[PDB]
Design an enzyme around this catalytic site. Structure first.
Site, PDB file in Angstrom:
ATOM      1  N   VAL A 194      28.630  59.176 -31.123  1.00  0.00           N
ATOM      2  CA  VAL A 194      29.748  59.932 -30.583  1.00  0.00           C
ATOM      3  C   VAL A 194      30.403  60.818 -31.614  1.00  0.00           C
ATOM      4  O   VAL A 194      31.096  61.764 -31.242  1.00  0.00           O
ATOM      5  CB  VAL A 194      30.800  59.081 -29.828  1.00  0.00           C
ATOM      6  CG1 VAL A 194      30.278  58.714 -28.457  1.00  0.00           C
ATOM      7  CG2 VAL A 194      31.225  57.829 -30.613  1.00  0.00           C
TER       8      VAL A 194
ATOM      9  N   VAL B 160      29.984  57.162 -35.899  1.00  0.00           N
ATOM     10  CA  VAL B 160      30.438  56.287 -34.838  1.00  0.00           C
ATOM     11  C   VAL B 160      29.465  56.340 -33.676  1.00  0.00           C
ATOM     12  O   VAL B 160      28.971  57.411 -33.299  1.00  0.00           O
ATOM     13  CB  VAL B 160      31.861  56.652 -34.348  1.00  0.00           C
ATOM     14  CG1 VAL B 160      32.362  55.652 -33.304  1.00  0.00           C
ATOM     15  CG2 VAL B 160      32.855  56.697 -35.529  1.00  0.00           C
TER      16      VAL B 160
ATOM     17  N   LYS C  85      31.896  52.021 -36.122  1.00  0.00           N
ATOM     18  CA  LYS C  85      31.946  52.977 -37.180  1.00  0.00           C
ATOM     19  C   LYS C  85      31.193  52.446 -38.426  1.00  0.00           C
ATOM     20  O   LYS C  85      31.562  51.421 -39.017  1.00  0.00           O
ATOM     21  CB  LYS C  85      33.408  53.310 -37.499  1.00  0.00           C
ATOM     22  CG  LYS C  85      33.592  54.285 -38.664  1.00  0.00           C
ATOM     23  CD  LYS C  85      35.053  54.618 -38.907  1.00  0.00           C
ATOM     24  CE  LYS C  85      35.163  55.382 -40.164  1.00  0.00           C
ATOM     25  NZ  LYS C  85      36.541  55.819 -40.332  1.00  0.00           N
TER      26      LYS C  85
ATOM     27  N   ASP D 170      42.914  56.891 -36.666  1.00  0.00           N
ATOM     28  CA  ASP D 170      42.409  58.046 -37.405  1.00  0.00           C
ATOM     29  C   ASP D 170      40.954  58.333 -36.987  1.00  0.00           C
ATOM     30  O   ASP D 170      40.040  57.698 -37.480  1.00  0.00           O
ATOM     31  CB  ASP D 170      42.554  57.841 -38.917  1.00  0.00           C
ATOM     32  CG  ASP D 170      42.414  59.147 -39.681  1.00  0.00           C
ATOM     33  OD1 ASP D 170      41.342  59.776 -39.515  1.00  0.00           O
ATOM     34  OD2 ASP D 170      43.390  59.570 -40.400  1.00  0.00           O
TER      35      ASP D 170
ATOM     36  N   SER E 199      30.239  62.044 -36.171  1.00  0.00           N
ATOM     37  CA  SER E 199      29.521  62.002 -37.441  1.00  0.00           C
ATOM     38  C   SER E 199      30.176  62.919 -38.486  1.00  0.00           C
ATOM     39  O   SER E 199      30.785  63.939 -38.136  1.00  0.00           O
ATOM     40  CB  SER E 199      28.065  62.404 -37.208  1.00  0.00           C
ATOM     41  OG  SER E 199      27.232  61.902 -38.224  1.00  0.00           O
ATOM     42  N   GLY E 200      30.071  62.548 -39.754  1.00  0.00           N
ATOM     43  CA  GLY E 200      30.645  63.342 -40.812  1.00  0.00           C
ATOM     44  C   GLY E 200      30.598  62.670 -42.169  1.00  0.00           C
ATOM     45  O   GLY E 200      30.077  61.557 -42.313  1.00  0.00           O
ATOM     46  N   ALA E 201      31.173  63.360 -43.158  1.00  0.00           N
ATOM     47  CA  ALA E 201      31.225  62.896 -44.540  1.00  0.00           C
ATOM     48  C   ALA E 201      31.785  61.479 -44.708  1.00  0.00           C
ATOM     49  O   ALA E 201      31.318  60.729 -45.573  1.00  0.00           O
ATOM     50  CB  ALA E 201      31.996  63.901 -45.417  1.00  0.00           C
TER      51      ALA E 201
END
Ligand SMILES: Cc1ccc(-n2nc(C(C)(C)C)cc2NC(=O)Nc2cccc(Nc3ccnc4ccc([N+](=O)[O-])cc34)c2)cc1
Ligand SMILES: CCCCCCCCO[C@@H]1O[C@H](CO)[C@@H](O)[C@H](O)[C@H]1O
EC number: 2.7.11.24
Length: 339
Positions: free
Chosen positions: A27, A35, A50, A165, A29-31
């Protein structure tokens, strides 16, 4: 004992989770992490899982990992994200390299709600009430959120709101207190009340209050509403060049908010006035905002709890990656699920 794990790759990422968690689909994604939505077979609930990215590949990552686990383990409040589970495939500390955090799945944020309907006053009341309730709890643990904005507020079908967050890598600056952008080196809790003010205004009018294009524009847009600093506030700036800069701008008077937010509950307007003060020492607190007549339908001084003591002394330590790792590992192992 230990659950049985299973492995799979989703988007060039290895997910090794207990069997209990099924139907994993990405659902976000990133640095910072990624998730997946999942079904928790044990409880029947849909969950978010996560997986932290490179949790111990740098000192900063290592401290963040520990910071996030500790904070999430502590939060036990209806209007704040809670931890359902935390796990690792590692069987020992010497093996420990990945951390997964599980919470309730929260597919819709406040931003979704605000695009897709014009809210009733009762609807604004309930949502703002719940933000201030969670914040009162967060602020009592001496935690400052620092990034309150609609996309960090989950809202379910029943209008029940949780602070979290969602970030993993709706401009932050739109909701940011004027002192954060001024790089005021020692800012406090009240920065979060500025943000609540901005979100509440947007809930009343259906549009961003201060949609600045940069930090300078942001400040101009703020001063058009709240006015250029007064005498008392100019005093709290010890820099002469700052004061002389500010004094050399076209002076903006304060707008009367009742004249700006047309057709909003007068009580909401009064509450907004108290939230959106430039001088942070004058902002209403979360505990105080809860007792404001705007929330007479919701307020219960006996059902607005504070956090247990939160040991944050690690923040001021400078430690080795494997020290942060071992400490994180103690926290995984000692975790007790909620009922
Ligand atoms: C380094 C660090 C330290 C602390 C935090 N932090 N802080 C807080 C406060 C307590 C202050 C509100 C909360 C967090 N972290 C936090 O919420 N983490 C955290 C932990 C597990 C899952 C999530 N994401 C999600 C939960 C539920 N449904 C989701 C649905 C979709 C997505 N999506 O598409 O990306 C993400 C979801 C966030 C975040 C980062
Ligand atoms: C360019 C317009 C000026 C904006 C001034 C923002 C005033 C912020 O408010 C200040 O925040 C500090 C940080 O916590 C406090 O220590 C001060 O007591 C308070 O006055």
């Amino acid at each position: 004992e230990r659950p049985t794990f299973y492995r799979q790759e989703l988007n060039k990422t290895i997910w090794e989770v207990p069997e209990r968690y099924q139907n994993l689909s990405p659902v976000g994604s990133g640095a910072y992490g990624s998730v997946c939505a999942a079904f928790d077979t044990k409880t029947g609930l849909r969950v978010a899982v996560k997986k932290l990215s490179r949790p111990f590949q740098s000192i900063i990552h290592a401290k963040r990992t520990y910071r996030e686990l500790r904070l999430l383990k502590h939060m036990k409040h209806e209007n704040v994200i809670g931890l359902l589970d935390v796990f690792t495939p590692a069987r020992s500390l010497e093996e420990f390299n990945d951390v997964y955090l599980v919470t309730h799945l929260m597919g819709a944020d406040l931003n979704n709600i605000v695009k897709c309907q014009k809210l009733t006053d009762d609807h604004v009341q309930f949502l703002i009430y719940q933000i201030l309730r969670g914040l009162k709890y967060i602020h009592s643990a001496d935690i400052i959120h620092r990034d309150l904005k609609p996309s960090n507020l989950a809202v379910n079908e029943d209008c029940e709101l949780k602070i979290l967050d969602f970030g993993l890598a709706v401009a932050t600056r739109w909701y940011r207190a004027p002192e954060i952008m001024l790089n005021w080196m020692h800012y406090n809790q009240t920065v979060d009340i500025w943000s609540v003010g901005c979100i509440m205004a947007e809930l009343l009018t259906g549009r961003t209050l201060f949609p600045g294009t940069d930090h300078i524009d942001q400040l101009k847009l703020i001063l058009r509403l709240v006015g250029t600093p007064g005498a008392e506030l100019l005093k709290k700036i010890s820099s002469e060049s700052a004061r002389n800069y500010i004094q050399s701008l076209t002076q903006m008077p304060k707008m009367n908010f009742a004249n700006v937010f047309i057709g909003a509950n007068p009580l909401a307007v009064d509450l907004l006035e108290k939230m959106l003060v430039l001088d942070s020492d004058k902002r209403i607190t979360a505990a105080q905002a809860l007792a404001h007549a705007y929330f007479a339908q919701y307020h219960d001084p006996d059902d607005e709890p504070v956090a247990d003591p939160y040991d944050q002394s690690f923040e001021s330590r400078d430690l080795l990656i494997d020290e942060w790792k071992s400490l994180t590992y103690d926290e995984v192992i000692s975790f007790v699920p909620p009922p």
